Design a protein around this motif. Structure first.
Motif, PDB file in Angstrom:
ATOM      1  N   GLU A 275     -10.352   3.742  16.043  1.00  0.00           N
ATOM      2  CA  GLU A 275      -9.094   4.078  15.499  1.00  0.00           C
ATOM      3  C   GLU A 275      -9.090   5.745  15.132  1.00  0.00           C
ATOM      4  N   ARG A 276     -10.347   6.068  14.968  1.00  0.00           N
ATOM      5  CA  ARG A 276     -10.586   7.529  14.747  1.00  0.00           C
ATOM      6  C   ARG A 276     -10.717   8.328  16.021  1.00  0.00           C
TER       7      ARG A 276
ATOM      8  N   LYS B  42      -8.763   7.578  18.915  1.00  0.00           N
ATOM      9  CA  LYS B  42      -7.330   7.644  19.268  1.00  0.00           C
ATOM     10  C   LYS B  42      -6.505   8.768  18.512  1.00  0.00           C
ATOM     11  N   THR B  43      -6.764   8.859  17.149  1.00  0.00           N
ATOM     12  CA  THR B  43      -6.204   9.916  16.287  1.00  0.00           C
ATOM     13  C   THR B  43      -6.782  11.143  16.433  1.00  0.00           C
TER      14      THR B  43
ATOM     15  N   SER C  90      -8.072  14.778  18.362  1.00  0.00           N
ATOM     16  CA  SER C  90      -7.271  15.648  19.055  1.00  0.00           C
ATOM     17  C   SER C  90      -8.248  15.916  20.336  1.00  0.00           C
TER      18      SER C  90
END
Length: 86
Positions: free
Chosen positions: A54-55, A57-58, A60
């Motif tokens: 999840e970290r 995809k979040t 940049s």
């Protein structure tokens, strides 16, 4: 999925490790760090990953860069290794 197994029993330390992607690196590096602090603590890959993936995809493109340069080289290194191996 539904593998539940980090690695395998039948594997020689000679053969080159499969190709890894920027993503993987993020997960791996994160793990090694967890052991550095909590080496005597369990890590539910299932959960640990849920927080990592999840970290990823979040993150940049800029942040992923750090893992981009490495992975980008992980594809050229393995490719060349295969040439000598087989």
């Amino acid at each position: 999925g539904s593998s539940g197994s980090s690695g395998m029993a039948k594997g020689d330390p000679k053969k080159p490790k499969g190709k890894m992607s920027a993503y993987a690196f993020f997960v791996q590096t994160c793990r090694e760090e967890h052991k550095k602090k909590n080496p005597e603590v369990p890590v539910n890959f299932a959960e640990f990953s849920k927080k990592c993936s999840e970290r990823w995809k979040t993150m940049s493109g800029k942040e992923k860069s750090k893992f981009d340069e490495m992975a980008k080289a992980d594809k050229v290194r393995y490719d060349r290794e295969m040439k000598d191996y087989g």
